[PDB]
Structures are given as C-alpha cells and as structure tokens.
UniProtKB/Swiss-Prot annotation:
This is Indoleamine 2,3-dioxygenase 1. It comes from Homo sapiens (Human). One of its GO terms (molecular function) is tryptophan 2,3-dioxygenase activity. Pathway: Amino-acid degradation; L-tryptophan degradation via kynurenine pathway; L-kynurenine from L-tryptophan: step 1/2. Its main location: cytoplasm. Binds 1 heme group per subunit. In the active form, the heme iron is in its ferrous state Fe(+2). The catalytic cycle does not alter the oxidation state of the heme, but IDO1 is prone to autoxidation. It catalyses: D-tryptophan + O2 = N-formyl-D-kynurenine; L-tryptophan + O2 = N-formyl-L-kynurenine. SUPFAM superfamilies: Indolic compounds 2,3-dioxygenase-like. It comes from the Eukaryota. Keywords: Cytoplasm, Dioxygenase, Heme, Immunity, Iron, Metal-binding, Oxidoreductase, Tryptophan catabolism.
C-alpha cells in the first residue's frame, strides 16, 4: 500500500505535517494563525481583503501544498461565516480565491476545507520522540477560542489512526482468499476486528476534550459548507476563478477514507441504491485525496470478502467476519450517542435528517452480519 500514499503508522492521515510555509506566504500564515483574535475583533474580513494575490509557484513539495490548502481553507471558513452568528460573505476575494482554486485543482480537491485538511493534516507532535498520544499532540489551526477544535480534530485523528492499524491487514485478507489459506484469512479478520475495537475505545476521549455547547453553537458553524445551504442558496463566488457561484459540501467524517474502506472490504453497501445515505458517502469520496479515492475503487475491484465467507459454511470464518462487522456497529452506535449529546440535546436548548442518515448507515452495517 504505497502508490496509495498510505502511511504504515498513521494510515490515511498525512504523516509529519509541515507546520510552517515559505516566507513568501507569511501574510497567509499570519491570518490563519490568528483567526480567533482576528474574528473576535472584527478585522478578519478586512485583513483578508487587504491581501496581495500570491503565487502558489513557491509551494514546492506536497506537504507544503497541504499546509497551504489548510491555511487557505481555514481562512475561507473564517471569511464566509465570520463571527458565526449570521453575517455571511458570499464572495471570496480574488486575492485568496484564485490561489486557493489553483492549489485545490492542483491537488484534485474541492476548494473547501475538508477532513483531509482539518484532521488528516492539522496536527503536530509536541516531542517527536514521544508517541502519538493526545498529550503529545496539538492542532495547527482553530477558528475561535473555546471552539474545542483541538479536541474534536485530535480525537478524530486518533480514532483514524487506531483504525489505520487494520489497513495493513487488507492485503493478507485478499491473498489468503486467493491462495485459499483458511487459517490465515481467519486470523487476519480477527486482527482487523481487534483494530476496529480499539478505535472505539479511543473515541471515548471525546468527552474529555469536547464541549457540547461549543461543538454545536460554534465549531459546527465554521465546518459548514455551501451545498443546499439557505445562507448561500447558490454557492460561493470564487472571484477571479469561476464566473458562476459553486456549491461544495462542508467537512464531514463521511469524507474519511478508513471507515469507507471497511464498509467496502466487508461488502457493506453504504453506496448502493441511490438512497440519500449512499449518494452522500459516494459524493464525499470526491473530497478525499485522489490516492485515497483510488484505494477505495481498487478494493471494489477485488473478490468480495463477504461472498467468500458466505460461501464456505465455516462457522469460524462467519464469526471472524462478524467480529469485524460488529465493531463497525459498535462504533456507529457509540457515534449516535455522541451525536445525541453534542447536537440533538444542545439543538433543544434540522437535526432529524442527521439521525436518519446515521441510523441508515448503521442499519445497513448491522444488516450485514451473518447471525
Ligand atoms: C462531537 C463529536 C462528533 C460529532 C458531534 C459527530 C457528529 C457527526 C454527524 C452529525 C455526522 C453526520 C454526517 C455528516 O454530517 O457529515 C457525522 C458523521 C460521521 N461521523 Fe461523526 N461526529 C463526531 C465525532 C466523530 C468521530 C470521533 C468519528 C470517528 C472517528 C466520527 C465518525 C463519523 C463518521 C464515519 C461519519 C460518517 C457516517 C458513518 O459512516 O457512520 N465522528 N458525525
Ligand atoms: O452542520 C454540521 C457541519 C458539520 C458536522 C460534522 N462534521 C464533521 C467534521 C469532521 Br472534520 C469530522 C467529523 N466526524 N463526524 C462528523 C464530522 C455536523 C453538522
């Protein structure tokens, strides 16, 4: 798993993110780094408009394009939504929208902030010798003070990385099916359920680092896009780049490649039927880095793992296979508890279509067991 830009340690996350940009972009890095102060004080829009269009030409390597995609993405969010209480800007100054779309088209990602930006690429190690633990990590950017962007993004990333552990087992699954190595296929499928089970226990920290009021009345604002959004019914103007406004979807863990790849590996068909849930998870593949996108389409090239287990009358496999599927139902069920706390309950102090979506995606996962 190498032309797919999958890291063995952190999987789909970008390993070792650049923290700083070339000096040529210090007028970008200064806004990005002070979005909370700059919003609260009423200047961010100003300070953005008073900017010189910069060239991306001095963004050499990928990690530099990736930091800049993040820097510009966070700034865009800050510009459009501003203070997060309804004063929306619907035109993105050419001095920012042009070099953003330039980089976005270069990296075949939409010009909006995505999961691969504010999670897969929005982190640093405090001490490079300590492991990947919460106490040794931080985020590079945030929107407001108290938006719990650090907790949300790092727990998200830490759960990714947990599930990542399973990705290195996918080759052995497919090889054990080809070579008809029954003992091995079984072990590999239990190893994968075990990784998905640790991913859940990690998710448990969310409560210690996120605040419901903050997630719902603040962070969720800055993460919202402009697709089917009343406040931007027609999209955003990317001044100096598109002639018409363009709708793009806010960030969402449906943009995450790990969970899609296990729904695919296990033959769970979140992307079938043309239902609302399937279409959405399919669309979000277009917000994933291109290599992570071909990773998914390449698994689908493979012999179904599900059909292979069905077809063997081998209780021990049907268990190993169900151990995997169950872990996704565990996670999806624990996710709904958190959605109840961090959205539904604050919302009452809209939120029904979310639950239909999450509950359909679960229902499709549970209805894939063999029990
Ligand atoms: C406060 C914490 C969290 C909240 C409030 C939250 C809320 C939501 C909501 C409302 C959705 C609806 C889909 C969308 O709008 O994009 C969603 C999707 C999703 N969330 Fe979260 N989420 C949180 C943390 C996490 C974490 C830590 C994970 C896993 C690491 C996760 C995994 C997902 C996934 C995979 C989806 C896509 C649907 C699915 O496959 O289950 N979320 N989340
Ligand atoms: O209006 C909104 C906008 C965004 C959201 C949630 N979006 C997310 C962003 C990131 Br990054 C990671 C995530 N995990 N689970 C959800 C999720 C909910 C209501």
């Amino acid at each position: 798993s190498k032309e797919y830009h999958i890291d063995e340690e952190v999987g789909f996350a970008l390993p070792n993110p650049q923290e700083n940009l070339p000096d040529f972009y210090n007028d970008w890095m200064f806004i990005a780094k002070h979005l909370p102060d700059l919003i609260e004080s009423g200047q961010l829009r100003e300070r953005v408009e008073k900017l010189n269009m910069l060239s991306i030409d001095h963004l050499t390597d990928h990690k530099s394009q990736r930091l800049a995609r993040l820097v510009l993405g966070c700034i865009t969010m800050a510009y459009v939504w501003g203070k997060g209480h309804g004063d929306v800007r619907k035109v993105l100054p050419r001095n920012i929208a042009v070099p953003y779309c330039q980089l976005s088209k270069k990296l075949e990602l939409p010009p909006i902030l995505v999961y691969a930006d504010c999670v897969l690429a929005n982190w640093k190690k405090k001490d490079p010798n300590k492991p990947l633990t919460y106490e040794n990590m931080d985020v590079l950017f945030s929107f407001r003070d108290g938006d719990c962007s650090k907790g949300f993004f790092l727990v998200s990333l830490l759960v990714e990385i947990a599930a990542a552990s399973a990705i290195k087992v996918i080759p052995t699954v497919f090889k054990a099916m080809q070579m008809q190595e029954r003992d091995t296929l079984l072990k590999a499928l239990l190893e994968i359920a075990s990784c998905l089970e640790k991913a859940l226990q990690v998710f448990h920290q969310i409560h210690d680092h996120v605040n419901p009021k903050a997630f719902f009345s603040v962070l969720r604002i800055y993460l919202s896009g402009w697709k089917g959004n009343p406040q931007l019914s027609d999209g955003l103007v990317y001044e100096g780049f598109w002639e018409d406004p363009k709708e793009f979807a806010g960030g969402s863990a449906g943009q995450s490649s790990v969970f899609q790849c296990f729904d695919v590996l296990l033959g769970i068909q979140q992307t079938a039927g043309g239902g609302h849930a399937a279409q959405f998870l399919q669309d979000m593949r277009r917000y994933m880095p291109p290599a992570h996108r071909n990773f998914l389409c390449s698994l689908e090239s493979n012999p179904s793992v599900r059909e292979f287990v069905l077809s063997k009358g081998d209780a021990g496999l049907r268990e190993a296979y169900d151990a995997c599927v169950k872990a996704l139902v565990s996670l999806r069920s624990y996710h709904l508890q958190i959605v109840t706390k961090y959205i539904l309950i604050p919302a009452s102090q809209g939120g029904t279509d979310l639950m239909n979506f999450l509950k359909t995606v679960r229902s499709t996962t549970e209805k894939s067991l063999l029990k």
